[PDB]
Structure 1
């Protein structure tokens, strides 16, 4: 027998590479090229989604595309002024009392010589007391830029597509465990389009499971690892902010503007959000039905609210419409398992530092008008605690706060392999 050379053999190895964007704004789709699938019969490929390299590259990409969008906007460095603030009581609701503060300060004008007396509205979570004289909360760590009004935070879908010489393997397993062997693997050019939403406790506008509710963890015995739940039937939610704000442009420099909240047209009420009752009960019943497989039969699985920490991790924080919400969600995780609607007391903050960074915030300008908003709840991020053994009772609390876990629920059926076309094999021929 003599060795031969075959060029173009179908073998691959696992590797890491540079995945370029593709699309059908903050997320710069101008650079993305505009936008197929080949089934593979007799192959079984070992998958892993907690060691996946696509999620970290996607997270760094999302951070950098966020950072390049705030570059040409106004710095808002002169806004750090000694504010002078009082309450606002144009017929304020008793639950709303103390949240909104009228404020007035001295601001520089377009000319460098003169100055003007400007009034604005600020929430209680934005101003802090000087130790009535107040000041902004960002004047202590880092003064930060303002989000420009022309760009929008709407999550356009993007496709992550591999270059030449690589391939993306997609599982068609209908009951995929999240790791281990995959009986049916399909080779696609690239993904289905991922919406890069931002959330903390509940996943929004995600991809649904197609047959049953799947719960995936890196280690179900360990309590320090998060628990990702994927739904099969969506739960509808309503965003609501029932106020009519007026944006007035205050000019603080030669060609720079500071869009401040002017006044409220009418009554002020809380910016609640509504979820259905029976739909949530049926979905949570399916969830508590499945979790008894991993944890044991006749075990009392109950749900408590969030443990603590800062406001971002503890509260549900989404971005619908253009304002930043921070909702309570304590009427959602209360039950113990052996036409009503659950309303949630939500609150709005303006100075936002999103990607867990210090010294880099961003002022969100107010949006004129009333905001109506709906979305689907197609995923939860749970976290158990250190309960004692043989108690037959476990409490699950909504965790979150890490932005990798939102995009690990979409890139859970993908991997990147490096095709190598060279191989050797023996046969009967001999070179003449």
Structure 2
């Protein structure tokens, strides 16, 4: 026989390239992305079993890195709190207390700058305790010896907007459509697209909010289920309704710092002072865990006994539910969610929750952002679509909430995608000659 060649042959190879965004005032520069395809197509790939590995997926790495970069571009172009890093003369706010708020709200006076540099303003404001540290009466902001704090830019929205991603021509995105696919391995039912479904950049920990749901049943995905150093990703089939609040009618105040710039300070509270909290339906939560436990039993290989215990790291970013409600940051105590063992009305547990105003995204060093206060009362709702849980090192195993890497929120939603390049050229033996 003879050798002949072909172009446009339907074969491919794994490849890693960049992703192109598509999106449809905000903090993701969504208006800087191409409009999405309102009528995209996907094809069933006939008679192909391919392999996916969500823990080796560069798409995850890229979306994670891109949000970090994007965040800074969105936050960078506005006023700093540098002149605000002064000694604070503080007392407690004891005026309208439920006694659960003791020491939580502080009243401090200080001397800050104004439009004319020779003049100073003696002003006062309110603080939430978590962001203020005693110097010894005399207090300073916690980040005064660590980082510059940028005031968040005032006309922004942090409510996640799903971003769709497209392969460059010559590349394609393979999706796993095989129900109950647990990662790392063969997926017999896949489809191919040029552009995929958008994913919301939800940033939270120990509860995954407003993501995808399992088609039928709770599924556990873990790089190594017996590795005591690993977490597990829990994808729920049933969303859990959660209701969070800041039950205070807030005022806001704005005082000039410099030449056309002002700081937004905390003002005061109308009505009394109350603790933030979150509610879930009780049976729904109990049934949810029964399903999780059933899946863990599958991994154990029997109807073994397990415990759900409390997180213990010395860090709010590790042990609490980290959540952005509107523009304010919740650090909720989740202890009422994981306080049981499993052996083979729906009044909520009203998780108490703390509010922090100055935050440090991604736990990096030398950066900080101040969240301006919001006037009025804040209420928000969400769907818990998954969990990030971990395990301890006997016969009974203990599972706990955990995972400090926001990259895994990306990983969870991206568990079903892989990128390949198309290889249109090939050769074959043939009866044909030139």
Q: What TM-score do the two structures reach when normalised by structure 2?
A: 0.97
CA-CA distance at 1:391 after TM superposition: 3.1
Hey, what's the Cα distance between the residues in 1 that align with 2:315 and 2:51?
Answer: 39
1:110-149 superposed matches below 5 A: 110-149=115-154
Hey, what's the Cα distance between the residues in 1 that align with 2:75 and 2:220?
Answer: 37
Aligned to 1:161: 166
* Aligned partners of 1:26 and 1:152 also within 8 Å: yes
* Aligned partners of 1:172 and 1:186 also within 8 Å: yes
Hey, what's the Cα distance between the residues in 1 that align with 2:66 and 2:194?
Answer: 20
CA-CA distance at 1:309 after TM superposition: 2.5
Hey, what's the Cα distance between the residues in 2 that align with 1:232 and 1:332?
Answer: 18
Per-residue CA shift, 1:395-415, capped at 9, x if unaligned?
A: 001111101111111101110
Structure 1 segments of 4 or more deviating over 4 A? none
Give the stretch that moved more between structures: 365-374 or 334-343. Answer: 334-343
Per-residue CA shift, 1:334-385, capped at 9, x if unaligned?
A: 0111131111110001110011201111111101110011001110111101
1:69-80 superposed matches below 5 A: 69-80=74-85
SS at match of 1:426: strand
Hey, what's the Cα distance between the residues in 2 that align with 1:184 and 1:165?
Answer: 22
CA-CA distance at 1:87 after TM superposition: 0.9
Aligned to 1:28: 29
Per-residue CA shift, 1:127-157, capped at 9, x if unaligned?
A: 1111211111110111211101101101011
CA-CA distance at 1:246 after TM superposition: 1.0
SS at match of 2:295: helix
Hey, what's the Cα distance between the residues in 2 that align with 1:47 and 1:296?
Answer: 24
SS at match of 1:168: strand
CA-CA distance at 1:46 after TM superposition: 1.3
Per-residue CA shift, 1:193-224, capped at 9, x if unaligned?
A: 10111111010001000111000111111111
CA-CA distance at 1:237 after TM superposition: 0.4
Tell me, yes or no, if structure 1 residue 288 matches structure 2 residue 297: no
CA-CA distance at 1:296 after TM superposition: 2.8
SS at match of 2:324: coil
Per-residue CA shift, 1:83-129, capped at 9, x if unaligned?
A: 11111111211111100001110111111111111111011111111
CA-CA distance at 1:191 after TM superposition: 1.7
Per-residue CA shift, 1:46-72, capped at 9, x if unaligned?
A: 111111110001100010010101111
SS at match of 1:233: strand
Q: How many residues align?
A: 427
Hey, what's the Cα distance between the residues in 2 that align with 1:126 and 1:294?
Answer: 42
SS at match of 1:187: strand
SS at match of 1:199: coil
CA-CA distance at 1:308 after TM superposition: 1.6
Per-residue CA shift, 1:161-218, capped at 9, x if unaligned?
A: 1111100001110121212111111001222110111111010001000111000111
CA-CA distance at 1:426 after TM superposition: 1.1
Hey, what's the Cα distance between the residues in 1 that align with 2:195 and 2:183?
Answer: 19
Aligned to 2:361: 354
SS at match of 1:190: coil
* Aligned partners of 1:320 and 1:373 also within 8 Å: yes
Hey, what's the Cα distance between the residues in 2 that align with 1:144 and 1:91?
Answer: 30
* Aligned partners of 1:298 and 1:392 also within 8 Å: no
* Aligned partners of 1:43 and 1:184 also within 8 Å: yes
Tell me, yes or no, if structure 1 residue 371 matches structure 2 residue 374: no
> For structure 1, which runs of at least 5 residues remain unmatched after alignment?
none
SS at match of 2:245: strand
Hey, what's the Cα distance between the residues in 2 that align with 1:161 and 1:330?
Answer: 41
* Aligned partners of 1:239 and 1:372 also within 8 Å: yes
* Aligned partners of 1:202 and 1:377 also within 8 Å: yes
SS at match of 2:238: coil
* Aligned partners of 1:307 and 1:397 also within 8 Å: no
* Aligned partners of 1:80 and 1:143 also within 8 Å: no
CA-CA distance at 1:392 after TM superposition: 2.4
Per-residue CA shift, 1:19-69, capped at 9, x if unaligned?
A: 110011111112210011111111111111111110001100010010101
Hey, what's the Cα distance between the residues in 2 that align with 1:304 and 1:43?
Answer: 43
* Aligned partners of 1:144 and 1:360 also within 8 Å: yes
* Aligned partners of 1:350 and 1:363 also within 8 Å: yes
Per-residue CA shift, 1:225-264, capped at 9, x if unaligned?
A: 1100000011100011101111111101011110001111
Per-residue CA shift, 1:294-330, capped at 9, x if unaligned?
A: 1131311110010223111111111021100000100
Hey, what's the Cα distance between the residues in 1 that align with 2:299 and 2:168?
Answer: 40
